[PDB]
Design a protein around this ligand. Structure first.
Ligand SMILES: CCCCc1nc2c(=O)[nH][nH]c(=O)c2[nH]1
Ligand SMILES: CCCCc1nc2c(=O)[nH][nH]c(=O)c2[nH]1
Ligand SMILES: [Zn+2]
Ligand SMILES: [Zn+2]
Lengths: 362, 362
């Protein structure tokens, strides 16, 4: 396999399905990336993550550079070996969390320094397969002046990220680099940003700044004009999105890649995804319900345990409850992505989306 | 398979190895029973418990009758179906926890009623394979007068337990009933108790009251005279024991069955069992240690992850840390029991025990 090769096999409207080939494996697109926050997808063995159908996972840079540390992970053999996941890993740059969980300057951010060069070096030390440019995730809402200033800095940072990555032979030969579009909800700033990014040149293009408070209507509105601005022949990654219906609508608008903590975090808190919508398994109505979490789901959890048992586990605060809920939720997300890929491949994705929404929202 | 058949295949001194055949499967003896407190072996799928080599697990009656409730579990298909463990389950009577986690009377105990008849009915509702007589676990230390009064009540309760079990056709035909010897640390009271129990007649005999504060020397002293009092041709179960070295010494004194929460509870708190003794994986010395938890262990955890990674997980409070530590610890206990069975079968158990202790304590 090549360092990086994105191929589109089928299209329907703005939707695409295809593959990203990388040295550590193939990613089927549209792709959902489970989030591993501190070198673990919470409550799952990596074999279990794979078993659900995930082709790639996301690691957060901010958390790893703090614990256990990037240099330490590198000394230990890199993140794949450390955590036991041998397939592609996408790492974020750290740019988001350093502000949400500071001294900001043109150089980077100081907190209790992270900069483009340090972020790219940390992602190298981790042995990341897909490296995110170090950016600034503009808060929502933002005035046009502030969003412009923020976007402009991010684009200067994107060039610095590009050069830092290219300056390291082994990273440039074995990993890929994605740029991140900003500009808040403003069309002209999104265009400026896309333009800047394309001029630099990246292996893929994320749509940043849309998982930070916008309602779905608004996020969709911004995607409508923003995704066509990106190079068509490269993957499009919507950072931090989202709910099952967010994902369907974003694929309808040309997104190829997704991540979000909802299936893991929700799962631990008792929310299970079903084709008829989410359910809160702690609800007393499930106390004697012998059905699986979802009537159609092919996951191991639905093959073996009832709602009643998982209800008991979550109410009791049992670790196995977190494990079972998380596995099901991640499997549900993967089955959603499989249904999306198959329906685009068959030219019936628009119908799938309609059908999905009618039932999920009933 | 028969309802119950205990066969001794090999002996060495007081040590025995053999099998208990039951309708739901075969139990290899000496046996270690992982404890499932609220219908789950904490942080493990039942398939994982089996994978470690466990033939039977223990369920606590007290906790189940409180949550989710015995009648409810029965309505749901019984405990095996509920939790997804299809092999034998031994349940305790509830007698211990109702006092440690009250109004005591000859009838039973009232708390925020449990009695012999109710305890046996609850264990039936759960669908237990091995039912423990409802007893009183005498506190340690106890004066001889108090231990005698306590033991005497337990023996009256043992007869009531016997009759309650026999009065239910399906339970008597499909499960087994164990009696529990009391008498604190006193030889004459242990003899009285054994005598009473044998007169009633049980399928197996537990040694109760020795996991409640006695040091090893004392526990061993009491086992020395207590186990020979029990019927030779029935299993001998030491409730609540114990550490790896407790278990070796107790097999040397004729015990066939063990349970304790140490491998699970310890595991979650960062203690890992090794042939060179326990280690506390949170210790900074493991932060860059690439070795497995134990150099010889055949478990899945030691095949795949390093001390360094598990150290990170436990320090980070990650669920996967609890899962990995627990799997290893339960696998270690099972490998210990396998080594014990093989060495008795080969007539080299005395040497094994010597060798085990020299290394575990070095
Ligand atoms: C709460 C979800 C946040 C998702 C996210 N957005 C962004 C972004 O806009 N830029 N850089 C990032 O790492 C990033 N991560
Ligand atoms: C803290 C470990 C307690 C083990 C135990 N001992 C006993 C006993 O002596 N009688 N009945 C029981 O259920 C029981 N359980
Ligand atoms: Zn499922
Ligand atoms: Zn191990």
């Amino acid at each position: 396999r090549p360092r990086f090769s994105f191929s589109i096999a089928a299209r329907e409207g703005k939707a695409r399905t295809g593959t990203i080939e990388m040295k550590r494996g193939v990613i089927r697109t549209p792709a959902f990336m489970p989030v591993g926050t501190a070198a673990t997808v919470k409550a799952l063995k990596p074999e279990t993550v794979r078993a659900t159908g995930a082709d790639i996972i996301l690691g957060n840079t901010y958390h790893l550079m703090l614990r256990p540390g990037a240099e330490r992970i590198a000394k230990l053999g890199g993140l794949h070996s450390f955590m036991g996941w041998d397939r592609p890993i996408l790492t974020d740059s750290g740019g988001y969390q350093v502000m949400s969980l500071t001294k900001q300057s043109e150089e980077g951010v100081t907190f209790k320094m992270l900069s483009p060069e340090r972020s790219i070096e940390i992602q190298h030390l981790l042995g990341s397969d897909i490296v995110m440019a170090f950016d600034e995730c503009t808060p929502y809402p933002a005035t046009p002046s502030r969003a412009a200033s923020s976007m402009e800095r991010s684009m200067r940072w994107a060039k610095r990220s590009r050069d830092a990555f290219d300056s390291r032979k082994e990273q440039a030969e074995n990993a890929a680099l994605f740029g991140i579009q900003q500009g808040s909800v403003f069309e002209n700033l999104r265009q400026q940003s896309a333009d800047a990014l394309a001029e630099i040149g990246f292996d893929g293009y994320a749509v940043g700044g849309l998982a930070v408070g916008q309602g779905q209507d608004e996020m969709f509105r911004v995607l409508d004009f923003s995704v066509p601005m990106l190079p068509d022949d490269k993957p499009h990654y919507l950072m931090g999105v989202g709910k099952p219906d967010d994902i369907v609508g974003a694929v309808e608008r040309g997104i190829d890649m997704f991540d979000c903590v909802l299936p893991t975090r929700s799962g631990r808190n008792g929310q299970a995804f079903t084709w008829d919508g989410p359910i809160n398994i702690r609800n007393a109505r499930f106390s004697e319900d012998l059905k699986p979490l979802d009537s159609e789901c092919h996951c191991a959890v639905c093959q073996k345990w009832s709602r009643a048992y998982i209800h008991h586990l979550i109410r009791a605060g049992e670790i196995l409850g977190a494990m079972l809920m998380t596995e099901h939720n991640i499997a549900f997300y993967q089955q959603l992505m499989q249904k999306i890929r198959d329906s685009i491949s068959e030219g019936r994705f628009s119908q799938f989306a309609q059908d999905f929404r009618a039932r999920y929202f009933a």
